[PDB]
């Protein structure tokens, strides 16, 4: 009995990391292909057939998406599901009529595939997501494999600098008419992940009454390897791979990588960028700054910084 975990493009990602909003798509096999041509006694058959799935404490909202035999048959109406509270919490599917299930599936060597999906609990923010299977045939129990995936919660920071590669001026003072540089520190997306990037984006709510947006610059925080083998050196200016927008009436600033560039990044390269926003102080008072960061639909906030005039 085996279980795999699959990505959007149907490929296995056992052992790879995923993000808090992941859907875990599992495919589990109840293996009867080794019983092809069997002649079991009648008391062995009457002990029946069952399949067990045991998720750990990370996983939540089970959805049985299908249960099918290898010949195409939808077999869900031949099984009885129980959720029980293998000796803790688990799901189990036993065949309602052992004899007829034996004749139609077991003795023909037809495997049954269970396609199950789960979400991650919001209060599981790190560690390993696990899912195990077992199977019971003619009363004999057999464990199979456990699939494992790390849950990585993203994390970002903001600082305010006098200028780039300069020094922090947080809670300090700024002369009227001067420039300051906000630095938004992106999360480094790790290598060995089980997903491709479609979104990598900052939203910064500038205090437009007191700060005038001049310009921005985005730079690689790590060497980035694309799928075709091209290395992008750490420190490189990533501007042509991004799109900036700034609304002068609201203060809303956005910097987003293009989907087409992010699709080129290799799953075994890390990926990260830092964003430097240059502003001019045009009014006295206390000036606060915060940002939000989105990575494939997952949102996190930076700390709030302040400067005075």
248 φ, ψ (degrees, to nearest 5): -75, -15
Report the C-alpha gap between 62 and 24 in whole angstroms. 10
- The candidate with the shortest Cα–Cα distance to 94, out of 51, 42, 133, is 51
Q: Is 104 helix (H, G, I), strand (E, B) or coil?
A: helix
| Fold of the 1-153 domain | Immunoglobulin-like (2.60.40)
Torsion of Cα atoms, 257 then 261 then 264 then 269, to 10°: -40
Q: What is the CATH number of domain 154-309?
A: 2.60.40.740
Q: How buried is 209 (Cβ within 10 angstroms: 0-12 exposed, 13-18 middle, 19+ buried)?
A: exposed
User: What CA–CA distances, in Å, run from 65 to 51, 118, 174, 195?
Assistant: 16, 10, 59, 21
Is the fold of 1-153 the same as that of 154-309? Answer: yes
Neighbours of 247 (CB within 10 A): 12
Q: What is the resolution of this structure in A?
A: 2.5
Report the C-alpha gap between 111 and 114 in whole angstroms. 10
Report the C-alpha gap between 186 and 273 in whole angstroms. 5
What are the boundaries of each domain within the chain? 1-153, 154-309
User: What CA–CA distances, in Å, run from 154 to 109, 188, 189, 241?
Assistant: 46, 8, 8, 22
Report the C-alpha gap between 50 and 157 in whole angstroms. 50
End-to-end CA distance of the chain: 68
57 in Cβ contact with 130 (< 8 Å):
no
Q: How buried is 20 (Cβ within 10 angstroms: 0-12 exposed, 13-18 middle, 19+ buried)?
A: buried
Please give the structure tokens belonging to residue 265: 């990044």
Residues 6+ apart with CB under 8 A from 106: 32, 35, 38, 49, 137
Q: How far is CA 144 from the centre of its chain?
A: 25
188 in Cβ contact with 272 (< 8 Å):
yes
User: What CA–CA distances, in Å, run from 26 to 5, 115, 176?
Assistant: 5, 6, 59
DSSP 37-88: T----HHHHTT-EEEEEEE-TTB---EEEEEEETTS-B-GGGEEEEEE---S
188 in Cβ contact with 270 (< 8 Å):
yes
- The candidate with the shortest Cα–Cα distance to 24, out of 97, 139, 134, 130, is 130
100 φ, ψ (degrees, to nearest 5): -80, -35
Give the determination technique: X-ray
Secondary-structure breakdown of the chain: helix, strand, coil percentages, each rounded to the nearest 5: 10, 50, 40
Residues of the chain with a following break (C to N over 2.5 Å): 85
């Amino acid at each position: 009995p085996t279980k795999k975990v699959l990505d959007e493009n149907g490929q296995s990602i056992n052992g790879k990391s995923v993000l808090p909003n992941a859907t875990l798509d599992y495919v589990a096999k109840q293996n009867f292909s080794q019983y092809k041509g069997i002649k079991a006694s009648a008391e062995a058959i009457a002990k029946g057939f069952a399949f067990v799935d045991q998720p750990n404490e990370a996983l939540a909202e089970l959805t049985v998406k299908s249960i099918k035999a290898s010949n195409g048959d939808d077999v869900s109406s031949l099984l009885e599901m129980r959720h029980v509270l293998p000796v803790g919490e688990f799901y189990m599917w036993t065949a309602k009529d052992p004899q007829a299930f034996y004749k139609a599936y077991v003795q023909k060597g037809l495997d049954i595939t269970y396609n199950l999906s789960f979400k991650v609990k919001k209060e599981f923010t790190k560690g390993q997501i696990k899912n195990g299977v077992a199977q019971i045939d003619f009363g004999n129990g057999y464990t199979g494999n456990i699939v494992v995936n790390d849950l990585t919660t993203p994390e970002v920071h903001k600082d305010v600098l006098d200028k780039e590669d300069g020094k922090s001026i947080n809670n300090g003072t700024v002369k009227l008419g001067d420039e300051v540089t906000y630095k938004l520190e992106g999360w480094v997306v790790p290598a060995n992940r089980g997903y491709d990037l479609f979104e990598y984006k900052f939203v910064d709510h500038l205090q437009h009454t007191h700060d005038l947006y001049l310009k921005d610059k985005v730079v690689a925080k790590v060497a980035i390897t694309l799928k075709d083998g091209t290395v992008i050196p750490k420190g490189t200016n990533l501007v042509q791979y991004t799109e900036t927008v700034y609304n002068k009436e609201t203060g809303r600033y956005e910097l987003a990588f293009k989907a087409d560039f992010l699709a080129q990044v290799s799953r075994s390269s890390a990926f990260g960028a830092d964003d430097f926003i240059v502003v001019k102080r045009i009014k006295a008072g206390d000036v606060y700054n915060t940002a939000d960061f989105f990575v494939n639909g997952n949102k996190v906030k930076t700390e709030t910084v302040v400067t005075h005039t």
